[PDB]
């Protein structure tokens, strides 16, 4: 790892709209003219299939294990965040994050997180939706006239905090602090610019609770956003009660 | 409903083969997780800005925007000494900065 590519949602949208509206664009160079775009358009088909399969009651518990699927998820989430230089277009990199969060929204109620590096990359992927600022709360509030894609992340974090074993032990050791990933985790944690991760996660979870929007204008908005509010408050309550209780300095 | 975590276990559920409580819990499980996980078969399928983006309209607009900007370059037979420079301020930005600089001593 050299740089954790934490690009936000809106800057990714602007990069897409500035790559499509380019005169010398290569976004439609076809499939048979380049093998790297053939590998990328096979992987995008794989991700669209895997996000399409996971909307069934039996597939959501069969995909939950399948050691193969968990290894593929922990394999792509590394590549889309740490070394995205191999993906050709900049829309494919957003579309991998846009269906990895969908396929992790339906699975995570039975998912047992395998490794700690995957448990960190889940956090960075969920954080990467939303808009930061330029200590305090480092996340401006996401107004939901744009897109409900950040509301899928506050359910991944609400369901993956419900297990006191691997799910919460890995999250605890990541937020507060088998022989090479000790060097990888300690390289990824100080590449993420103490306790910036905890206040970033809590400030993002204080986003997607639309306080300003439901308190500006009275029952329709809370009746529409009660599940995302409930799961965000559950996640913040879990982080407050079971993570925060000493190596702090702020 | 809201069935269980035990109803999601692999023992109480079917597998690739080749009781009454299980067949009662799997009724509520498939009646709960098929009204929850079912996709939206209606509108608001746009989801964002970068899904209803059109490659054909942007390609047509870039074909026009390259052609006219190249006709601006070559075919405009105005010499380089005769290309008059544009103003770096407007007729309103030059009034507001005369107003605020007058009101800056308060």
């Amino acid at each position: 790892p050299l740089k954790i590519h934490r690009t936000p949602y809106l800057t990714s949208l602007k990069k897409i709209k500035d790559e499509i509206d380019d005169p010398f664009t290569k976004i439609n160079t076809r499939g048979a003219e380049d093998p790297k775009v053939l590998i990328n358009d096979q992987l995008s088909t794989i991700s669209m299939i895997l996000r399409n399969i996971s909307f069934s009651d039996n597939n959501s518990r069969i995909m939950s294990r399948n050691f193969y699927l968990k290894r593929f998820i922990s394999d792509l989430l590394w590549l889309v965040l740490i070394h995205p230089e191999n993906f050709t277009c900049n829309r494919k990199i957003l579309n991998f994050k846009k269906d990895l969060v969908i396929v992790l929204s339906n699975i995570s109620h039975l998912l047992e997180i395998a490794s700690s590096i995957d448990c960190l990359l889940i956090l960075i992927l969920v954080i990467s939706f939303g808009q930061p600022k330029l200590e305090s709360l480092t996340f401006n509030e996401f107004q939901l006239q744009w897109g409900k894609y950040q509301t899928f992340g506050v359910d991944i974090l609400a369901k993956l905090f419900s297990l006191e074993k691997p799910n919460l032990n890995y999250f605890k050791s990541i937020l507060l602090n088998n022989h090479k990933d000790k060097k990888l985790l300690r390289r990824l944690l100080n590449l993420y610019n103490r306790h910036n991760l905890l206040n970033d996660v809590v400030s993002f979870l204080f986003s997607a609770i639309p306080l300003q929007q439901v308190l500006s204008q009275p029952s329709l908005l809370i009746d529409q956003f009660s599940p995302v509010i409930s799961q965000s408050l559950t996640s913040i309550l879990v982080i407050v009660q079971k993570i925060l209780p000493f190596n702090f300095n702020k | 409903n809201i069935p269980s975590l035990t109803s999601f276990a692999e023992e109480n559920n079917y597998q690739y083969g080749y009781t009454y409580a299980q067949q009662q819990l799997n009724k509520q499980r498939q009646d709960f997780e098929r009204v929850r996980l079912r996709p939206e078969q209606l509108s608001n399928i746009i989801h964002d800005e970068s899904d209803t983006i059109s490659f054909r309209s942007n390609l047509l607009k870039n074909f026009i925007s390259s052609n006219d900007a190249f006709n601006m370059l070559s075919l405009t037979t105005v010499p380089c000494d005769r290309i008059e420079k544009s103003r770096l301020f407007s007729e309103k930005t030059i009034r507001y900065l005369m107003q605020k600089q007058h009101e800056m001593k308060t």
Partner: peptide, 19 residues
């Protein structure tokens, strides 16, 4: 795609209640 239903939050609260 699937917007977040009330059943997701009920399943989450059940997961936190039965643990």
């Amino acid at each position: 795609i699937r917007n977040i239903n009330v059943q997701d939050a009920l399943l989450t609260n059940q997961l936190y209640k039965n643990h």
